[PDB]
């Protein structure tokens, strides 16, 4: 009774963006809801789902008091640049995890600083099957991954764990009860991608643009926010604003 996260942009009536939390003040009408927007008229869930079937519509959400600092996952083109900005400019606000690997420790490496080294590939496989990792992968036949416990340690000491992970990790963290701020940075156009990345050609930028549209579709239920902008500085402001807003002690979580 009744707050929902909108999973689409709506341009009518109450405008809203993918990620916005709406207070639905009246849902009696099958086609149209009245809604408030926890910073008008909006399509009902069934109406929007009919339009899209012709599916991301609304997700019910609720308040939670948490007792840890939320991990941060930035997705989309520009994520590497923004993650770099955050951890470098704000080292006292963000922490990173130390990943695990089965690759052998090399001469100048330090366990617990470079990696948590795992002596047996079979043991790391068991741990992955036992859901001890939020993300794992292979390189040169060795396994690598970011553990639930490493993220929990950062969250519990009071820093935001900046995670370079894919969208499938968001779900894993929700299950672990370490709800992340998950922000997708959505490009406006291929032109915009080129504007803010004068490195790429208009074939590379097009592929990047394409990949982002698909990512938003695939993981659109899991984002807690979506940001857009015409400059990197506008984007970066909006990301910091979103991190602040979604920091709690009080936060919105799926119902």
């Amino acid at each position: 009774s009744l707050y929902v996260r909108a999973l689409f942009d709506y341009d009518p009536g109450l405008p809203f963006k993918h990620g916005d939390i709406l207070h639905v003040t009246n849902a009696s009408d099958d086609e149209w809801w009245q809604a408030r927007r926890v910073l008008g008229i909006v399509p009902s869930k069934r109406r929007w789902e009919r339009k899209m079937r012709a599916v991301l519509s609304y997700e019910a959400v609720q308040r939670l008091s948490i007792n840890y600092t939320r991990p941060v996952i930035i997705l989309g083109p520009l994520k590497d640049r923004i993650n770099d900005d955050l951890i470098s400019e704000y080292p006292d606000k963000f922490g990173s995890c130390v990943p695990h690997t089965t690759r052998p420790k090399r001469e100048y490496e330090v366990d617990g600083r470079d990696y948590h080294f795992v002596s047996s590939r079979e043991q790391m496989e068991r741990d992955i099957q036992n859901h001890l990792f939020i993300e794992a992968g292979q390189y040169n036949d060795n396994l690598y991954g970011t553990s639930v416990a490493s993220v929990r340690e950062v969250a519990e000491k009071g820093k935001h764990c900046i995670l370079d992970v894919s969208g499938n990790a968001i779900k894993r963290l929700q299950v672990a009860q370490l709800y992340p701020v998950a922000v997708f940075i959505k490009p406006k156009s291929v032109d915009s991608v080129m504007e803010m990345n004068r490195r790429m050609t208009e074939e590379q930028a097009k592929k990047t643009y394409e990949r982002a549209i698909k990512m938003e579709q695939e993981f659109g239920e899991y984002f807690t926010g979506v940001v857009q902008g015409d400059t990197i500085e506008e984007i970066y402001s909006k990301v910091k604003s979103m991190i602040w807003s979604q920091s709690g002690p009080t936060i919105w979580v799926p119902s």
Binding site: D114, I134, G137, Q138, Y139, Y144, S166, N168
Partner: peptide, 14 residues
């Protein structure tokens, strides 16, 4: 970490 930039991700069941 160079190696982490080069991963083929494995799906975590379920």
């Amino acid at each position: 970490r160079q190696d982490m930039e080069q991963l083929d991700l494995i799906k975590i069941t379920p």
